Design a protein around this motif. Sequence first.
Motif, mmCIF file in Angstrom:
data_model
loop_
_atom_site.group_PDB
_atom_site.id
_atom_site.type_symbol
_atom_site.label_atom_id
_atom_site.label_comp_id
_atom_site.label_asym_id
_atom_site.label_seq_id
_atom_site.Cartn_x
_atom_site.Cartn_y
_atom_site.Cartn_z
ATOM 1 N N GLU A 135 -7.213 -20.097 17.857
ATOM 2 C CA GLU A 135 -7.668 -21.007 16.820
ATOM 3 C C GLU A 135 -9.142 -21.307 17.031
ATOM 4 O O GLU A 135 -9.642 -21.268 18.155
ATOM 5 N N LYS A 136 -9.828 -21.620 15.936
ATOM 6 C CA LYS A 136 -11.243 -21.964 15.954
ATOM 7 C C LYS A 136 -11.386 -23.476 16.019
ATOM 8 O O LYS A 136 -11.047 -24.172 15.058
ATOM 9 N N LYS A 137 -11.911 -23.985 17.133
ATOM 10 C CA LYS A 137 -11.782 -25.398 17.422
ATOM 11 C C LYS A 137 -13.079 -26.175 17.604
ATOM 12 O O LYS A 137 -13.002 -27.377 17.877
ATOM 13 N N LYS A 138 -14.253 -25.559 17.462
ATOM 14 C CA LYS A 138 -15.511 -26.309 17.500
ATOM 15 C C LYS A 138 -15.634 -27.059 18.836
ATOM 16 O O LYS A 138 -15.393 -28.256 18.970
ATOM 17 N N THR A 139 -15.887 -26.269 19.866
ATOM 18 C CA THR A 139 -15.896 -26.782 21.222
ATOM 19 C C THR A 139 -17.097 -27.702 21.469
ATOM 20 O O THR A 139 -18.045 -27.767 20.690
ATOM 21 N N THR A 182 -12.613 -38.830 21.975
ATOM 22 C CA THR A 182 -11.435 -38.018 22.239
ATOM 23 C C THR A 182 -10.329 -38.906 22.790
ATOM 24 O O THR A 182 -10.506 -39.555 23.825
ATOM 25 N N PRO A 205 -10.387 -23.149 23.818
ATOM 26 C CA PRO A 205 -11.555 -23.868 23.299
ATOM 27 C C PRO A 205 -11.495 -25.363 23.538
ATOM 28 O O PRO A 205 -12.533 -26.027 23.448
ATOM 29 N N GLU A 206 -10.315 -25.914 23.819
ATOM 30 C CA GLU A 206 -10.190 -27.338 24.090
ATOM 31 C C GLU A 206 -10.895 -27.744 25.370
ATOM 32 O O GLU A 206 -11.226 -28.920 25.530
ATOM 33 N N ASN A 260 -18.838 -19.933 23.758
ATOM 34 C CA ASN A 260 -18.433 -21.190 23.148
ATOM 35 C C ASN A 260 -17.917 -22.206 24.156
ATOM 36 O O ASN A 260 -17.421 -23.260 23.751
ATOM 37 N N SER A 262 -5.817 -32.154 26.511
ATOM 38 C CA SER A 262 -6.375 -31.293 25.473
ATOM 39 C C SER A 262 -6.452 -29.881 26.032
ATOM 40 O O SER A 262 -7.421 -29.516 26.700
ATOM 41 N N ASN A 318 -4.497 -25.680 25.226
ATOM 42 C CA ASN A 318 -3.454 -24.814 24.690
ATOM 43 C C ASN A 318 -2.675 -24.275 25.881
ATOM 44 O O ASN A 318 -3.104 -23.331 26.542
#
Length: 541
Positions: A39-43, A63, A102-103, A139, A327, A329
């Motif tokens: 997934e694309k998560k904007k790190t 957060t 990415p989390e 990223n 946070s 995956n």
Amino acid sequence: RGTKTLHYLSMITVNGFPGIENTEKRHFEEPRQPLLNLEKKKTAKNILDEQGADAVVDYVKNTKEVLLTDTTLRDAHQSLLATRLRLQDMKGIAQAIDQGLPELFSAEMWGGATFDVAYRFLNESPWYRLRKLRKLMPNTMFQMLFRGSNAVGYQNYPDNVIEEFIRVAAHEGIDVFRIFDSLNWLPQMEKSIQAVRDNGKIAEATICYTGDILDPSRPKYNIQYYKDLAKELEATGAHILAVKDMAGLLKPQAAYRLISELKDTVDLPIHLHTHDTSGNGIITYSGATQAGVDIIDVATASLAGGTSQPSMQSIYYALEHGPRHASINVKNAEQIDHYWEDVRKYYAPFEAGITSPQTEVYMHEMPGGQYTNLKSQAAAVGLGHRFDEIKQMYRKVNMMFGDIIKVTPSSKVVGDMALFMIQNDLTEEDVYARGNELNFPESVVSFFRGDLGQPVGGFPEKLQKIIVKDKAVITDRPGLHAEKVDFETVKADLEQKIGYEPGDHEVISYIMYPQVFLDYQKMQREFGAVTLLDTPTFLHG
Ligand SMILES: O=C([O-])CC(=O)C(=O)O
Ligand SMILES: [Mn+2]
């Protein structure tokens, strides 16, 4: 590079890898490649690139979940594999980590002992490792461990060397600098904190935890001391406050108490770093999560537990239905962990041995690295039997040293003394009586000369004179006395020595590891880029 490569292959085939036993090359299967749901998560790395460090700390503050920092690339294998993890192994899974997790707040992939070890024992440049990983991992925020007034070396350096190192490290990819001092002394931290702020990066001001805030028999490092140090750290503009527990001394009830008191003392987000040496790392992190910590340092399961960080995978399930979640995956993490399980098998010659939780560390607060170095340098000099009482000696000399913080390189000071007294059958009461003729270890006289900074509470004056007989004792920053370095002349003195014009990273590498860097250059002349070989071929021919 064929001739260099065959020369190295012949050298290891015939004479074996130095420092390890000439085991026959084993058949290894290719490590499992992870199957990832992406997934694309904007790190947080994207936020730092786009809007700076204050945007990142706002992101951390807002957060709800507890963020994670992956220490698999630095501290996990510093603890378990003697810092021997190779770039060739990292690069096989770096993209999987970057895309699949990415989390992650950051990945701790630099600093500590990795800088020295890469050069010295792996014959690969730390800067090369940083560049390759940064390209592969675009990223994810990169985190380094920075030792205050001495960047990755040991000796104190002038301030310009430190600032130039910070600028080069930030230009080459490092985003988060966990800046710490071996004695929790601000003057060694503030200059490098300012340099990190000036290079647009994130500054993590670190308080090393030691002692026990919930035991009233040790009031030196009581909770008020931590709160005052935190307030003053926040006064330096540091973006984040880290609470380095280098020995895993922070216990679950203290962690909850400590984080909460820090939480309402300062406003910085809190980053907790603990080692699982005692087997209580997960419950400590869970206790800090209740108190409201923001980021916790974890390692992948295969390089976790024991002297490493608590497991990334286990902490997720430890919090799965609680008020605050991790946070991460976790399914992607479990898949990535399969790769690390397999490549760890290449590093069997560097494994410590059968590891079980040890609460003796609550008594001898020696960090895991200082623990192996005392295994490696007590038995090797014929005292392996007595190691279980040099650990008691380690406890004693800490108290006589004024109950100091034991992290690198101050933990090398305590171990040097304790090993020295057992080596000469010196009790505490003789070093106060027969101490005027003994030749203390160099690391001890230098520490008592103020070369490591000023500890809290000062020195035990009477003991200090017994150690520093006729030597100058300084009471200010050692870097203030450091001999000035002019980079342009270092560039000239280095170009003539290596045969080519060095980049700005090679100059600082030469400054902070003169002999080591030049020895690496000699080996690169002879063998070339051994970093491109796989680990079994690298280690066994
Ligand atoms: O735990 C310690 O002693 C600190 C550490 O990782 C280092 O500075 O290499
Ligand atoms: Mn550590």
